[PDB]
Design a protein around this ligand. Structure first.
Ligand SMILES: CCc1cnc(C)n2nc(CCc3nc(N4CCCC4)nn3C)nc12
Ligand SMILES: [Mg+2]
Ligand SMILES: [Zn+2]
Length: 312
């Protein structure tokens, strides 16, 4: 049969958590299939259906600075690294579902937060009152799954299919950062009082939720130059939202106000301290082989510290 292969540098470096998928868009589909094949099997999906699914997913990501197709593949690659480093912890349906969930998790994102949609009074905010964009991303996922020749799950039973779509739904909803804080706190408590139990479905769900946050945030776990340049795309979106807030006659939060350009280094610190570090800490506790993510995050926190001290 036809295995996908990668040039030597990619073949080796793709296994590492800090891998960057590179500027050549046309190689991203192949990189994804490669990951599916090794983390799932060459038999997980019909190749022709999978390739058609990938291309429709790509088509449904928009040309925005951060929440775009490169982000989707980047988040899936972080998931691949987690899955490959925790071989025996996950079911076959989870392996299948989670890489798809990652590829799909920001489908049709417009570059605006849930909060902006609510203040704009976008139709999506009436259809979905919480986790607005995330329910939209899951809906887009189902749509694409139902296009002719796009059902990559065709070989699953009605109940297995239902289970995989449920994993995907929950994984996608979990990428709403508003939900992360409470999910991480519960996980922290369960881990510390030793109640955490991976045979408990609602516990697995929470663990997968945290994995999703970890993958979604993985720009903070890259080599410093990647981290730094990604942060520029992040703010390009936020600040455009800031402008749109001012158009509605609302002062945006500092994160989204381009007039606060100078405070960026300090905004990153609070973010690593409040969000990133706690996320990778708890994840490393639950899943020890993901420690390279915490380590990389800590390195990047220290780089933002250097930026503030004027040493960079
Ligand atoms: C998707 C959420 C996300 C993911 N990854 C990264 C690296 N970031 N960085 C941010 C912004 C972090 C931030 N910047 C600021 N401001 C900068 C100047 C004034 C205040 N306040 N805060 C909290 N958000 C994310
Ligand atoms: Mg999102
Ligand atoms: Zn995302």
């Amino acid at each position: 049969l036809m295995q996908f292969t990668l040039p030597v540098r990619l073949c080796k470096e793709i296994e590492l958590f800090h891998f960057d998928i590179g500027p050549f868009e046309n190689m991203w589909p192949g990189i994804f299939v490669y990951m599916v094949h090794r983390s799932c099997g060459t038999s997980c999906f019909e190749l022709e259906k999978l390739c058609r699914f990938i291309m429709s997913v790509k088509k449904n990501y928009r040309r925005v600075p951060y929440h775009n197709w490169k982000h989707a593949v980047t988040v899936a690659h972080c998931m691949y690294a987690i899955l490959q480093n925790n071989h025996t912890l996950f079911t076959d349906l989870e392996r299948k579902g989670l890489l798809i969930a990652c590829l799909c998790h920001d489908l049709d994102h417009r570059g605006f937060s849930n909060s902006y949609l609510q203040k704009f009074d976008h139709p999506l905010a009436a259809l979905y009152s919480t986790s607005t964009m995330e329910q939209h991303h899951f809906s887009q996922t189902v749509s694409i799954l139902q296009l002719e020749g796009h059902n990559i799950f065709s070989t699953l039973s009605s109940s297995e299919y239902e289970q995989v779509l449920e994993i995907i739904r929950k994984a996608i909803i979990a990428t709403d950062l508003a939900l992360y804080f409470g999910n991480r706190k519960q996980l922290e408590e369960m881990y510390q009082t030793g109640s955490l139990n991976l045979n408990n479905q609602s516990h697995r769900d929470r663990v997968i939720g945290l994995m999703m946050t970890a993958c979604d945030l993985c720009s903070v776990t890259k080599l410093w130059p990647v981290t730094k340049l990604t942060a520029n795309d992040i703010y390009a979106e936020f600040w455009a939202e800031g402008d749109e807030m001012k158009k509605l006659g609302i002062q945006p939060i500092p994160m989204m106000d381009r007039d606060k350009k100078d405070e960026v280094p300090q905004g990153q610190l609070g973010f690593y301290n409040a969000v990133a570090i706690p996320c990778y800490t708890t994840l490393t506790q639950i899943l020890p082989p993901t420690e390279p993510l915490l380590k990389a995050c800590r390195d990047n926190l220290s780089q933002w510290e250097k930026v503030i001290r004027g040493e960079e």
